[PDB]
């Protein structure tokens, strides 16, 4: 069972460009930036809450690592989408 | 010579009573200097019901 | 003109005290334990002896080593203990009971009492409406052991107002009261006050100052000054006001013509062949000049229009071109991805889709100084009253950013109306509850046996009888809003009758001082000594001005 | 019952996220809200970059996603190019560039 | 003086362990300090176990009930910025604003952290 996202970012590439097709050295392209970005963010996280003399991570470490890792537009854009997600999934009444 | 009476204002109450026929309508209605109670005929609730008058309308 | 406001003036004469003479061991005393003032004096007296602030400092000497203690008006004596002053109160309750203790000990002291094992005297105290168990346990405890004292009787200070002003004890009113933590509407039906049927809003004075402060620090956040409370508490009680209708207020509250009147300043406190050619040119420019100096004049006005034109033209193809989403960045793209996909004039195109961050800057300079240039020609030969923000900040005037005086100035346009219609409508200051005039609509229209429609007597007889009591009715305009939303709501013909009285905040005391004058319906209220030894401090005497038990 | 993803509004998966940062030993204690915030992350972060790659594949008129348009869609993006101005690419190109004079 | 006049003011203001105004029992407790945000949990946690020990009755006035219900009308929305009539809200922080120019140079510009306390003043964070 070796693992690797090809089916999430082949919907949300069909969502908005249906006719097109993605080539399987591209297709590695996309599977290891999604797990680079995923070790620098979590490393950062890490760094942070050994920090703070705190033994758990929670959202606020990651939203702090978001801030610190991408440039601005990008910082602010995903900082939004991610608090949009969050109080999407706490209000689940 | 004849004579205009006008009620007009915001509804507060709109409670209709039957006996499938509706015997008659109490409609509250709502204005700046006051609010006022009116009593209702059957055919003018059919007319309030044509024009889709709901709670809130003037 | 700016006003200028400051700290509130320190006072110079120390509190006094009264005599020891003409105290007697039998008369009652009163005592207003507000969150904001203390209220205190004897019976026989129609006005309190000594009103001071709920505040005490340890005052720490360095060279004696000795802790001191000042409460009160003592507190108003220098700007270091004024600052440091702390309040027995968190919030609606009392957390820390030894403040309480030695400020009741600073107040026996003052009152020129001669005590013999205690306090003689039975006190009348106020409190909250649905107090907790543990506060009533607490004051039954430190009453009844540290004080000895033989009667306790507890009420709301709304009520106690509404006593003095109807000493008669059985009539029909409402009381709406605006203290410095919440705001109470209490109905009363025959002289006894329906708690089942009492609402409040976690709203007061406290709170609004805070709205205040918080609006001020989010409008101007570069000010290099600091504002205290006490200032914002001054601006506040000098320039806030009800409107009449918030509707449209604000409509028309950031025009010009509204803001010369309705614009308050405040004020912090501070402390050779190419040569020769050029000289030819200019000699005709000069030649032509003082020929037509119209023409040329005009001339140049084109030419400084055409200027200006390409300037805009320029500033619009750069903000174009820093937009990702903008259809000049898919052309630009398009035209890379077409050198970058499949002569002298594609080698050219080539170099001309390089990019040019400083060229277009120094493109733009070189535009500036040729506009300066066509603008040096004509006169040879961006309104801020379109700008709502300016208006927001600055008001009607122009601004200097160079000036001293203009850098500490603050405007009051929109906070003037914007601060007191939150206890009309709570949701803006963050409470998710029902305004004033909600909850009386709801008690007057679909309660004590008033169906939506008609009234009942005794709903007319609430109507008739309106009183507006607490600190915080100081704010004009409050009652003449109170009687247009109840003439709104209301059926009409109906007569409306509100009633405030001079001060607002004094009535309570005189309440306590009439219940404690009129001795027959005193005996009601009062709580012995065995009466708390035999049912214990889980104990609730019911009577017609103060709280009832929990459950039925 | 149902996914957390579709809880939060997503496609990327939560408890996958959720599994890879509990024994990748980052710290002993995870909260809730941390999958689902990487999560959305992921999701603009990928949806950005497949945004760009395809406008560059439907720019050279051909119907697939080739590393070339990957490349055109890192180095022409401004902030893209910085989050990415160490990663080597495979198979990717260099972008067109002539310094001015040596254009006679 | 100013260091020497308020001496003279605590020097008339004294307060002793045996103090006159007090009784013979002083017996002076020890008590946590018991702030007001855990007042409303205890006296809640007290009133559920008074009410289940009843359902193994009803409340008259209690702090509780005293508390103001929801407005049933819909609420009228202002701008964060200006106070004025809220028109329109940005979708990326959820502010609502006046016109284009607030939103051009607050709404757009503003520094991430700014916006919650714009929200915290409605109760929106």
């Given amino acids: 069972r070796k693992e690797t996202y090809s089916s999430y970012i082949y919907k949300v590439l069909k969502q908005t460009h249906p006719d097109t097709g993605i080539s399987q050295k591209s297709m590695s392209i996309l599977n290891s930036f999604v797990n680079d970005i995923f070790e620098r963010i979590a490393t950062e996280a890490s760094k942070l809450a050994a920090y703070n003399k705190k033994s758990t991570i929670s959202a606020r470490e990651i939203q702090t690592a978001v801030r610190l890792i991408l440039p601005g537009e990008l910082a602010k854009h995903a900082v939004s989408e991610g608090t949009r997600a969050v109080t999407k999934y706490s209000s689940s009444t | 010579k004849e004579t205009k009476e006008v009620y007009e204002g915001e509804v507060t109450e709109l409670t209709p009573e039957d006996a499938k026929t509706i015997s008659h309508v109490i409609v509250g209605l709502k204005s700046a200097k006051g609010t006022k109670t009116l009593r209702l005929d059957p055919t003018i609730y059919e007319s309030i019901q044509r024009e889709k008058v709901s709670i809130g309308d003037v | ?552 | 019952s149902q996914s957390r993803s579709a809880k939060a509004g997503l496609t990327f998966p939560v408890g996958r996220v959720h599994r890879l940062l509990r024994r990748g030993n980052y710290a002993q204690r995870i909260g809730s809200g941390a999958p689902v915030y990487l999560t959305a992350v992921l999701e603009y972060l990928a949806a950005e970059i497949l945004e760009l790659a395809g406008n560059a594949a439907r720019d050279n008129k051909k119907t697939r996603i080739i590393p070339r348009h990957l490349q055109l869609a890192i180095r022409n993006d401004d902030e893209l190019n910085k989050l990415l101005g160490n990663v080597t690419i495979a198979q990717g190109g260099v972008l067109p560039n002539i310094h001015q004079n040596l254009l006679p | 003086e100013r260091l020497l006049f308020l001496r003279s003011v605590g020097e008339r203001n004294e307060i002793g362990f045996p103090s006159r105004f007090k009784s013979a029992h002083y017996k002076k407790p020890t008590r946590r300090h018991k702030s007001a945000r855990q007042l409303i949990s205890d006296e809640n946690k007290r009133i559920n176990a008074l009410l289940t020990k009843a359902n193994k009755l009803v409340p008259k006035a209690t702090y509780f009930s005293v508390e103001a219900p929801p407005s049933i009308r819909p609420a009228k929305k202002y701008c964060d910025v200006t106070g004025l009539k809220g028109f329109y809200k940005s979708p990326t922080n959820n502010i609502r604003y006046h016109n284009a120019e607030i939103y051009q140079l607050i709404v757009k510009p503003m520094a991430p952290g700014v916006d919650q306390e714009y929200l915290k003043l409605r109760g929106a964070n």
């Fill in chain 3, 1 to 552: 003109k700016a006003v200028v406001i400051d700290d509130p003036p320190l006072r110079q004469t120390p509190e006094p005290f009264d005599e020891q003479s003409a105290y007697n061991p039998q008369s009652p005393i009163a005592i207003d334990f507000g969150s904001s003032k203390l209220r205190a004096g004897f019976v026989n007296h129609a006005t309190p002896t000594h009103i001071f602030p709920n505040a005490l400092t340890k005052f720490r000497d360095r060279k004696l080593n000795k802790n001191f203690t000042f409460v009160g008006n003592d507190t108003l004596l220098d700007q270091a203990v004024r600052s440091q002053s702390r309040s027995p109160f968190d919030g609606p309750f009392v957390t820390n009971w030894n403040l309480t203790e030695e400020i009741l000990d600073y107040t026996f002291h003052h009152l020129g009492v001669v005590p013999d094992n205690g306090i003689p005297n039975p006190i009348l105290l106020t409190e909250r409406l649905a107090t907790v168990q543990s506060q009533r346990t607490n004051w039954y405890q430190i009453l009844f052991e540290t004080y000895n004292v033989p009667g306790v009787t507890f009420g709301i200070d709304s009520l106690f107002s509404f006593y003095n002003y109807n000493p008669s004890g059985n009539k029909t009113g409402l009381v709406i009261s605006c203290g410095h933590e919440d705001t109470n509407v209490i109905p009363v039906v025959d002289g006894a006050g329906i708690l089942t049927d009492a609402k409040r809003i976690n709203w007061g004075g406290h709170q609004a100052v805070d709205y205040l402060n918080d609006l001020m620090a989010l409008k101007y956040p570069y000010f290099p000054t600091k504002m205290s409370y006490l200032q914002y508490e001054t601006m506040y009680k000098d320039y806030c006001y009800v409107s009449r209708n918030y509707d449209e207020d604000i409509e028309k509250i950031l025009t010009l013509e509204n803001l010369d009147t309705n614009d308050v300043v405040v004020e912090a406190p501070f402390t050779e062949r190419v040569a020769k050619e050029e000289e030819e040119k200019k000699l005709k420019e000069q030649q032509w000049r003082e020929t037509d100096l119209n023409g040329w004049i005009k001339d140049k006005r084109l030419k400084l229009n055409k200027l200006i034109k390409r300037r805009k033209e320029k500033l619009k193809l750069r903000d174009e071109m820093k937009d990702r989403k903008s259809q000049v960045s898919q052309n630009r793209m398009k035209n890379l991805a077409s050198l970058a996909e499949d002569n002298d004039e594609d080698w050219l195109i080539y170099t001309d889709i390089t990019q040019n961050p400083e060229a277009f800057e120094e493109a733009l300079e070189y535009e500036y100084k040729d506009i300066v240039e066509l603008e040096r020609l004509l006169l040879e030969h961006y309104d801020w009253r379109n700008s709502i923000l300016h208006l927001f900040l600055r008001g009607p005037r122009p601004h200097d950013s160079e000036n001293i005086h203009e850098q500490h100035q603050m405007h009051l346009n929109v906070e003037r109306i914007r601060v007191p219609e939150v206890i009309f409508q709570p949701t803006m200051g963050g409470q998710d509850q029902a305004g004033i005039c909600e909850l009386s609509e709801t008690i007057l229209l679909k309660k004590f046996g008033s169906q939506p429609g008609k009234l009942s007597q005794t709903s007319i007889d609430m109507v008739n009888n309106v009183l507006i009591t607490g600190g915080n009715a100081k704010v004009p305009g409050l009652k003449e809003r109170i009687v247009k939303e109840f003439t709104g709501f209301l059926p009409t013909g109906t007569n409306i009758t509100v009633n405030m009285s001079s001060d607002p905040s004094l009535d309570a005391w005189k309440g306590m001082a009439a219940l404690a004058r009129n001795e027959e319906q005193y005996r009601k209220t009062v709580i012995s000594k065995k009466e708390y030894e035999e049912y214990g401090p889980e104990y609730i005497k019911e009577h017609k001005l103060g709280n009832t038990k929990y459950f039925e």
